[PDB]
Design a protein around this ligand. Structure first.
Ligand SMILES: O=P([O-])(O)O
Ligand SMILES: O=P([O-])(O)O
Ligand SMILES: O=P([O-])(O)O
Ligand SMILES: O=P([O-])(O)O
Ligand SMILES: O=P([O-])(O)O
Ligand SMILES: O=P([O-])(O)O
Ligand SMILES: O=P([O-])(O)O
Ligand SMILES: O=P([O-])(O)O
Ligand SMILES: O=P([O-])(O)O
Ligand SMILES: O=P([O-])(O)O
Ligand SMILES: O=P([O-])(O)O
Ligand SMILES: O=P([O-])(O)O
Ligand SMILES: O=P([O-])(O)O
Ligand SMILES: O=P([O-])(O)O
Ligand SMILES: O=P([O-])(O)O
Ligand SMILES: O=P([O-])(O)O
Lengths: 382, 94, 343, 242, 196, 98, 95, 44, 49
């Protein structure tokens, strides 16, 4: 195989050595206007001696702490870093591998805007109710009922029919569903149902409103306590007819399935309400919500801050196990973290990110720092 | 001779003309490549987009509360003039 | 008007909401925490959108005067910080697993020879030090916390032939083959207080040897954005934004008017009539009657000269843009932004 | 044909064993020395790396194979050495949190049909006309705020465009196209067989394992006289059959 | 909410619509081809927008699990394919004129000496092989086709001084000066089946 | 009257990057020929387990910048939008009502 | 158009201002011409600097980096022995 | 190889998103139009 | 190159700017293809009507 490898230029000489000298001189004299270099193989051949050991030997070692100190403000680890016989170690290949539990806390908000009903006009209410006593206390309602029914009786809105031809009424725990409605924009009078929030669930703008589901069909009604084996929900039907309907002929045109739910606003706050009052009320139908400010939270660029440096009472140690004389001598006067930022910039391209060291430089949007106001291309009305 | 042009060509041979340098008003004339050559790939308008009333309902009728006695009667624990819409929220489309 | 709305939203979210707190108000009927370093305070203070409307300095390229002195890295369009937040996930609860490099110059590149060594290091639990937020709020008060479950040390060894490694070890144990390293920044670092509204910062350095002195670099920091590393923990550090001192996110350089330097309170440096105003380094001029500003801003021709020489050796043979690979991220030219407006 | 690879993230491990006996590289080289672990889902030791489920071993292997980086620290290779189909340029680690369906006590498995968010403002299960009424959303659970749900973390990576690489080189480094171990195999007093075993994530359609056995695929061309062209081909090892 | 609408349209057009077919449905009242490789099938199957809504893994950088294993190059935002489509024009009917390079390693960079050579090549007509679509539908079934009107060979020659050219040829005919080439990939290629 | 329409999905159709597929390679019954006119021994010897099209993709990347387009060879690399492949959901700046 | 005045300014983020202790401000070697001459004007000198800055209505800090040689030399004479010699000059080391 | 020919990309080729036709029309809006209906047959 | 430019002219322009043309056509090195160079600005285009 070796004569073959030579012949096929898999091993052996490069072209400036195996080509005729006259050709090499010719190529060298003419290369800038007709190039011959790519027509001749130039083998590269690894060394086979004195570079790598043939013995059994680990590439990467993991050391676990031999001692550790877990204090209020810091956490200290001690290792026995071992460099065996016939090895050397470049400290650039070493690092601390850290696992733990981080809570970024309730001020963390890694996005702008809301996750909840983001398309809702920001002062629009959910379909909901309130009480008011001017005096007898009455329940008031505002909203819409989007699910068209075959009929409405004392059993609620009829949503379908049997193979026995009997009415099928909504199952109040999840029907009617707020997401459902007429499927087109386009002769008789039609009856409708919907959900509504009861007065005890204090009004929040639709925009931002979240309430966890209390069953797998997505209903949100609070589950009643001390019920035993029967799951019971805080849901009651409310029936309505036109204010102008004849008293002797009253019948439901709308039914709302009213419920209390665990209404929250995890990511929005109230930016306008008319007074200090928080309750469901007529005026509070027009409270306005705004999404909370974004607040990204992560470890620092290059994990700055995690390890103590330039810090008298928390100095790192690298010592020969014979002596104890510490080879690390640090000064409050030195700036190791910044020195490393500047070093990285001189070595490479700091616009590139590398997850392993959290190497992802702080930046800003230049069009935010310096406002360039060339106005807007609003020539056509929209 | 053309000295102004000669300097433009010279500057381009020495460095990167996309960089600006205020001292010499060194900021090359350019254009938006997407204006010079229109690439018309249309628009991603598959989803309709809607305008809604500030209250998210629009037109409502006025409703009284009623309860079954089936005969129905006025429920005096309920306001007699509640604004409720039937159907979907009024919307316009853009 | 779709375009006008796009622009007004962008201006409000990115600029108006980041105006200093003095431009904001608290409606009657809203109660905010008294602690102004808290998320609920920063989130609840109201900004009039017309402070930065779609007509803001219209037709200009101009940063807003109050914004020049606001840390522009404390922002939701800080893309590095956004990426680092998202590397962890999108939820507040994160069991994490990360690798942390050794940065101390004396050991971070050392070639260590056979033997057993004690290697120990201390890690911080202070959330304002080890975490960063885009708003800069006090994470200690706003409920962030970390615990460490395990820290292991990893090391990689080139699988060197044993005869070769042994010959290498023996050579490196010779004192003539001692290794040596300089810290990259290679400076004694010093911080001096500038009280609110002070304009003059005099400093003395008591008499010493200056042999091998290489020069000076300087910048200005906010005290609230600069933690003490003077001990294990800093109770007065109630801020979690970028910390220029440590990370290089400097942003107040435009606030320097001038520096003057005097050896032995009698010999001005450089003196020698070298500079246009030879007794000081004037960085910028407001009253500029000889015409010494340069480059269409208020920076002086002297200062422009000094910085171009200091970074690129450019200045004695005409000013021109430095080669991109010599004009890196923290370099002068790359970051220089002259601006004008009319009013 | 075109290099648009996109399923590299679906590999879990590969073992390589000559003559059914000799694990390669063996020699206690890797943290898991009997196979190449590419990624781990269970990782009690914390051998995963770079904030994803890729292992330290595999990350070392791919960085050495492409850039000769690994023995003296990991860092970004020079851009011009890290080209379109290179490892680092394409390596995309990622994480997210989701609700903990086991330990979040209020968890409800609400399928798509029963979720609502923007009820009243969007079409139901279709890109069609808005339907419904304004109502609190029942989904997604918040992972943030004072009422953030109990959660779990998921991490993974993409690495499109590349092929995974295992160089037959004693230290994985590029020291010569004709590798050190390639040269040693010349002194093999006998022929050897090779077994490999790849473990992959299951995919619900037919897929193919594509292996590139890296060899020398050479031609030498001789033109002795006008209009005469003669060619000698040698591919070695894995010499041809067509 | 203009911003929310822009984001939701983007997610829908670019992600939800490319979800695997198992995420889609056919409305009753809609009749699609039983051929699932077909444009009308891929265009007619319905995707619920809330599968990739504006709150999708909100605050995360995260590719969707089902999309990891969907060929991401089969997409209308593949700029290379979009450019290659638009080089031909914007209509389905295209008289074309193209230049196609020789890629075979043994001859693609060869310096060929004086002489007359037989040079033959074969070209495909199969539209699934020679064309590419961003959806990846079966272009045979979906009515694409091609005709070759002519194929000419062009060759360019350095106008070399004749004596210098004689010297060069003379040197290159010596077996010592034989040219050699390695296929760039330089591999034996093997495919092994993996059942579902 | 209330029927709703949606635009058809986009479907770009072109020749492939570098005109892949147009010429037969590595395909036994359709092997190219380059031979001396007399004594027509074929100097092209191709194999089914060679991959010439991919080999050329990778060669081009090693030689220059594949983000640049060259119309002459349909040299315009297949790519995808990075923000489609990996969704980065930082929400929307919808603080102001519109 | 209204009667107007003009305002000019600049930003320069990310840098520190630099004043090299080099006779022509140029980089001609890490150990500068003037750093070497100070071994011959071989006395101790006091230094005074006065920075003038725009007022800011909160406390700030002047950060001065005094550029020196900050060096360690590491000696490993026997198995498991490591000895380091540190010199920072000028501005030689404190505690 | 310099190739000329005739290509038909076929009826599935659509080099754009959206429509070329009345793109601003709400997506469920009709044209101005008529229909007949009988419950005598009339035009609406 | 899929436009109405001739092979002759494309040869002359590529030779004139880059010395490229007798040994294949390919994209010049970016730093030889500067703001006013031929390849950088060459924009072939087609449409149907
Ligand atoms: O091959 P060796 O010298 O490491 O035993
Ligand atoms: O920090 P929060 O929970 O009041 O938004
Ligand atoms: O260079 P950058 O970090 O400002 O994008
Ligand atoms: O204009 P595009 O790339 O946002 O469709
Ligand atoms: O004289 P300046 O400061 O307006 O240029
Ligand atoms: O072309 P540069 O000088 O910006 O690297
Ligand atoms: O062990 P981990 O890094 O995959 O969680
Ligand atoms: O390892 P051998 O059996 O090929 O000599
Ligand atoms: O000269 P010959 O040996 O190729 O006939
Ligand atoms: O041997 P030739 O050069 O005359 O064909
Ligand atoms: O036996 P082979 O691998 O040289 O073909
Ligand atoms: O959002 P998913 O599709 O990765 O679960
Ligand atoms: O081609 P000539 O210059 O040798 O006649
Ligand atoms: O005709 P030559 O090959 O001897 O120049
Ligand atoms: O002198 P040493 O190598 O036996 O420690
Ligand atoms: O040749 P390029 O890499 O500067 O585009």
């Amino acid at each position: 195989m070796l004569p073959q490898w030579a012949y096929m230029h898999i091993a052996g000489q490069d072209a400036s050595e195996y080509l005729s000298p006259g050709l090499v001189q010719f190529a060298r004299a003419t290369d800038t206007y007709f190039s011959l270099g790519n027509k001749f193989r130039n083998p590269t051949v690894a060394p086979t001696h004195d570079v790598t050991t043939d013995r059994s030997q680990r590439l990467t070692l993991r050391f676990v702490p031999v001692d550790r100190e877990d204090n209020t403000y810091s956490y200290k680890v001690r290792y026995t870093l071992a460099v065996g016989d016939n090895r050397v170690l470049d400290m650039a290949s070493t690092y601390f591998d850290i696992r733990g539990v981080l809570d970024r806390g309730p001020s963390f908000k890694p996005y702008s805007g809301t996750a909840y009903n983001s398309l809702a006009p920001k002062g629009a209410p959910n379909t909901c109710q309130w009480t008011y006593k001017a005096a007898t206390e009455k329940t008031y309602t505002y909203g819409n009922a989007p699910v068209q029914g075959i009929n409405i009786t004392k059993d609620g809105i009829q949503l379908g029919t049997d193979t026995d031809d009997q009415p099928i009424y909504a199952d109040k725990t999840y029907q009617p569903e707020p997401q459902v409605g007429d499927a087109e924009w386009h002769g008789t009078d039609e009856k409708y149902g919907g959900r509504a929030l009861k007065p005890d669930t204090k009004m929040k703008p639709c925009y931002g409103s979240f309430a966890k589901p209390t069953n797998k069909e997505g209903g949100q009604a609070n589950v009643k306590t001390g019920t035993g084996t029967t799951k019971e929900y805080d849901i009651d039907m409310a029936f309505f007819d036109n204010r102008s309907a004849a008293a002797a002929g009253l019948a439901p045109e709308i039914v709302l399935y009213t419920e209390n739910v665990d209404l929250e606003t995890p990511d929005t706050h109230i930016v306008y309400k008319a007074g200090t009052d928080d309750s469901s009320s007529s005026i509070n139908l027009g409270q306005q919500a705004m999404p909370n400010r974004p607040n990204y939270i992560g470890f620092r660029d290059n994990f700055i801050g995690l390890m103590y440096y330039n810090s008298t009472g928390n100095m790192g140690v690298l010592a020969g196990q014979a002596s104890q004389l510490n080879a690390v001598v640090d000064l409050q006067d030195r700036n190791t973290e910044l020195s490393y930022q500047l070093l990285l910039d001189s070595l490479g391209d700091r616009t590139r990110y590398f997850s392993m060291w959290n190497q992802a430089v702080d930046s800003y949007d230049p069009d935010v720092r310096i406002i360039e106001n060339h106005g807007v291309e609003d020539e056509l009305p929209n | 001779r053309n000295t102004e042009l000669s300097y433009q060509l010279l500057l381009d041979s020495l460095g990167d003309r996309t960089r600006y340098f205020s001292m010499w008003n060194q900021a090359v004339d350019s254009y938006d490549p997407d204006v010079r050559i229109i690439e018309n790939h249309g628009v991603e308008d598959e989803l309709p987009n809607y305008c809604f009333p500030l209250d998210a309902v629009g037109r409502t009728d006025t409703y009284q509360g009623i309860k079954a006695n089936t005969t129905w009667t006025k429920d005096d624990s309920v306001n007699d003039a509640n604004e409720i819409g039937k159907g979907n929220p009024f919307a316009m489309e853009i | 008007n779709i375009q006008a709305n796009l622009w007004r939203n962008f201006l409000y979210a990115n600029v108006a909401l980041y105006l200093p707190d003095s431009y904001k108000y608290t409606p009657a009927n809203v109660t905010l925490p008294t602690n102004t370093n808290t998320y609920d305070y920063m989130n609840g203070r109201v900004v009039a959108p017309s402070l930065v409307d779609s007509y803001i300095n219209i037709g200009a390229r101009w940063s807003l005067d109050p914004m020049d002195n606001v840390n522009p890295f404390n922002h939701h369009r800080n893309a590095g910080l956004r990426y680092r937040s998202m590397l962890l996930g999108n939820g507040r609860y994160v069991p994490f697993h990360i690798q942390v490099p050794q940065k101390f110059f004396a050991i971070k590149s050392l070639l260590l020879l056979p033997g057993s060594y004690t290697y120990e290091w201390n890690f911080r639990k202070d959330v304002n030090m080890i975490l960063q937020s885009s708003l800069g709020n006090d994470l200690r008060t706003d409920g962030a916390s970390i615990s460490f479950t395990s820290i292991n040390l990893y090391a990689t060894f080139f699988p060197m032939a044993h005869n070769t490694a042994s010959t290498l070890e023996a050579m490196l144990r010779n004192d003539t083959n001692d290794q040596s390293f300089n810290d990259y920044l290679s400076a004694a670092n010093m911080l001096y207080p500038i009280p609110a509204n002070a304009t003059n910062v005099p400093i003395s350095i008591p008499s010493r040897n200056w042999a091998a002195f290489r020069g000076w670099s300087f910048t200005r920091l906010k005290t609230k954005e600069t933690p003490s590393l003077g001990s294990g923990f800093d109770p007065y550090f109630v801020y979690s934004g970028s910390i220029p001192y440590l990370d290089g996110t400097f942003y107040l350089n435009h606030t320097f008017k001038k520096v003057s330097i005097t050896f032995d309170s009698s010999v001005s440096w450089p003196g020698n009539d070298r500079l246009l105003t030879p007794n000081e380094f004037e960085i910028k001029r407001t009253v500029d009657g000889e015409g010494y500003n340069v480059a269409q801003c208020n920076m002086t021709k002297d200062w422009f000269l000094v910085q171009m020489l200091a970074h690129y050796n450019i200045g004695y043979q005409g000013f021109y843009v430095p080669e991109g690979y010599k004009d890196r991220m923290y370099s002068f030219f790359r970051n220089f932004q002259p601006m004008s407006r009319q009013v | 044909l075109d290099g648009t690879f996109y399923l590299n993230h679906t590999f879990k491990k590969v073992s390589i064993t000559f003559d059914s006996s000799v694990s390669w590289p063996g020699n206690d080289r890797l943290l898991t020395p009997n196979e190449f672990e590419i990624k781990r889902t269970v990782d009690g030791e914390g051998y995963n790396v770079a904030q994803c489920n890729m292992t330290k071993d595999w990350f070392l292997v791919q960085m050495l194979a492409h850039y000769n980086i690994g023995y003296q620290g990991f860092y970004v290779p020079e851009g011009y050495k890290d080209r379109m189909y290179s490892f680092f340029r394409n390596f995309q680690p990622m994480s997210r949190q989701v609700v903990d369906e086991v330990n979040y006590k209020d968890y409800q498995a609400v399928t798509l049909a029963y979720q609502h968010n923007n009820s009243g403002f969007v079409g139901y299960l279709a890109p069609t006309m808005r339907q419904g009424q304004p109502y609190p959303a029942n989904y997604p659970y918040p992972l943030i705020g004072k009422s953030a749900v109990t959660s779990v973390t998921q991490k993974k990576f993409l690495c499109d465009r590349v092929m995974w690489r295992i160089p037959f080189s004693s230290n994985f480094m590029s020291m010569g196209a004709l590798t050190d171990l390639g040269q040693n195999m010349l002194y093999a007093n006998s022929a050897h067989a090779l077994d490999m075993n790849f473990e992959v994530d299951p995919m619900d359609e037919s897929t193919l394992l594509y292996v590139v056995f890296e060899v020398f695929d050479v031609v030498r061309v001789h033109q002795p006289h006008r209009g005469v062209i003669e060619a000698v081909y040698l591919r070695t090892p894995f010499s041809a059959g067509n």
